[PDB]
């Protein structure tokens, strides 16, 4: 679950072709917005351990994509964490 | 848009007290500058089983077409009310005119 | 996950000749057509033929003998977790000359028989009987 217009907001910024999501920079920006939308259910107390497993899965997906991106190109990594709140 | 039917049942002799509350049951929506789709009765009816020792009651529904961040105020709207015996919410379903 | 392109070819051969299939097909490659030309003239398949040029495929016609497959065992041995290299006499004897070992070599894909006849060695692909 993510707000209905919010996927297209990533295409309207990290995308470079209409309605396109093949970019790993779009995937990491979308996963970051999805993690933020899921932190709306947390940021308080640990009771939902099941929905927290899916949170750790998308946090691991972002970490697994960043490992692949750091192995691809260091500038494409550095310029992604320049537009997103990573290594704050 | 967010939708809720907001149907409630009142004590039959307190049906004379409901027109004094015709802006009070909607006070959560008027306080949000909105206006409900209906706020209309569904007549007086006999009960299939008796609730709080009543056997015939009067029915009203609102169709609020209003956001989920005042649905807790629509809970308090009935919490301290003496004229109701039961309310129910029925989420989504949309809202339309005629035929209740 | 999907781990090996040759197991996806050898399973079609081994299980297809157990299930009496006429001809079996998989994605092509330079290596896959090199071993097909050995397995053909060593009499382990009845035909091989390619299909396409962009996302290319290879079809192998299976060979039968006395109501069973012509092959008694086709074994990998040389696999992603362990590759095997064999020198000109270090080459093993597969089923006392009733089977072959297949070698890649720097000089073309061939049998250990042809490698001995050339004083040659290399990496193993498979052992067939």
């Amino acid at each position: 679950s993510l707000s209905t217009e919010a996927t297209a907001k990533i295409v309207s910024e990290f995308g470079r072709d209409a309605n396109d999501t093949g970019s790993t920079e779009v995937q990491v920006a979308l996963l970051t917005a999805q993690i933020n939308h899921l932190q709306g259910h947390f940021a308080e107390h640990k009771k939902d351990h099941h929905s927290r497993r899916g949170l750790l899965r998308m946090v691991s997906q972002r970490r697994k994509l960043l490992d692949y991106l750091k192995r691809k190109d260091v500038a494409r990594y550095t310029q992604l964490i320049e537009r997103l709140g990573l290594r704050r | 848009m967010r939708h809720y039917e907001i149907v409630f049942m009142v004590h039959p002799d307190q049906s004379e007290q409901v027109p004094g509350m015709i802006e009070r049951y909607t006070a959560a929506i008027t306080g949000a500058e909105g206006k409900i789709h209906r706020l209309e009765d569904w007549g007086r009816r006999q009960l299939a089983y008796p609730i709080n020792k009543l056997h015939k009651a009067h029915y009203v529904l609102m169709n609020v077409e209003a956001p989920q961040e005042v649905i807790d105020e629509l809970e308090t709207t009935f919490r301290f009310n003496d004229a109701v015996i039961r309310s129910m919410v029925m989420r989504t379903k949309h809202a339309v005119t005629e035929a209740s | 996950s999907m781990q090996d392109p040759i197991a996806d070819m050898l399973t079609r051969i081994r299980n297809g000749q157990a299930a009496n299939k006429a001809a079996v097909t998989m994605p092509s490659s330079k290596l896959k057509v090199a071993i097909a030309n050995v397995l053909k003239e060593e009499g382990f398949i009845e035909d091989f033929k390619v299909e396409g040029d962009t996302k290319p495929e290879l079809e192998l016609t299976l060979k039968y003998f006395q109501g069973k497959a012509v092959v008694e065992s086709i074994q990998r041995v040389s696999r992603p977790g362990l590759r095997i290299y064999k020198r000109k006499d270090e080459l093993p004897k597969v089923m006392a000359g009733l089977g072959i070992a297949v070698v890649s070599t720097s000089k073309g894909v061939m049998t250990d028989r042809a490698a001995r006849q050339a004083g040659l060695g290399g990496e193993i692909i498979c052992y067939v009987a």
Partner: protein
Amino acid sequence: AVVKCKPTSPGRRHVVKVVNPELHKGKPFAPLLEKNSKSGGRNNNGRITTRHIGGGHKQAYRIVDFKRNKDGIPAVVERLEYDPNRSANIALVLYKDGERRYILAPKGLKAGDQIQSGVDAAIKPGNTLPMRNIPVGSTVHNVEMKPGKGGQLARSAGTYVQIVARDGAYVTLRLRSGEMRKVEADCRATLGEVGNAEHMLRVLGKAGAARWRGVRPTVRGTAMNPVDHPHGGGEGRNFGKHPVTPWGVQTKGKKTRSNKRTDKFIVRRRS
């Protein structure tokens, strides 16, 4: 909150303190404070009339409007702060024309909330109305026992009362102590639960910390001689008699209620 302590002298590491960072740490509203000098548990001409009470620290008393003078006047909650005369914390209420009073606190900690008495007043907790206009099962906050007499019952941290029946002119309360009794439906209720609710999680730490909370020691009656306290007995450590008050009467299980005025309004009582 509540939070643990840290040791400065042996020992305190497992002690707990309440801590409420949403209350204003500033100064009480001065027109409502009285000297309220201590009496040491000793009456006008005494001699002790209540034991163990003695010592300070010095403390002014804050005048609260439990009587809720005037009716239907619009107000706002300007401040929420702690009060050491009590335990549920206090609210500073500001009426529309600049009148300020201290009033018994809600469960809420958000300030600027607009509050008024009435029945066409918003249905929310904190807006006070007569119990003739509310349904059964409701939590009523602090209430008056006679119309216009002012707030008694459920004034301590997180405490409340519930109305469990109503008929004609009267309403039945259920008390958390195990009591159940009637009051007149002309009596005012503020609805919901009172402030703090954490006070029972505190554990003080060290004997001296009570000495500035109006406490002094007094020796065990069982440790002195029977001329002094009647619980005293020769050689001690084996009494051979029932435990008693300082006047030689039972001190386990003996009931003492003798009011006879308010009892015909009661349905059920504390065990």
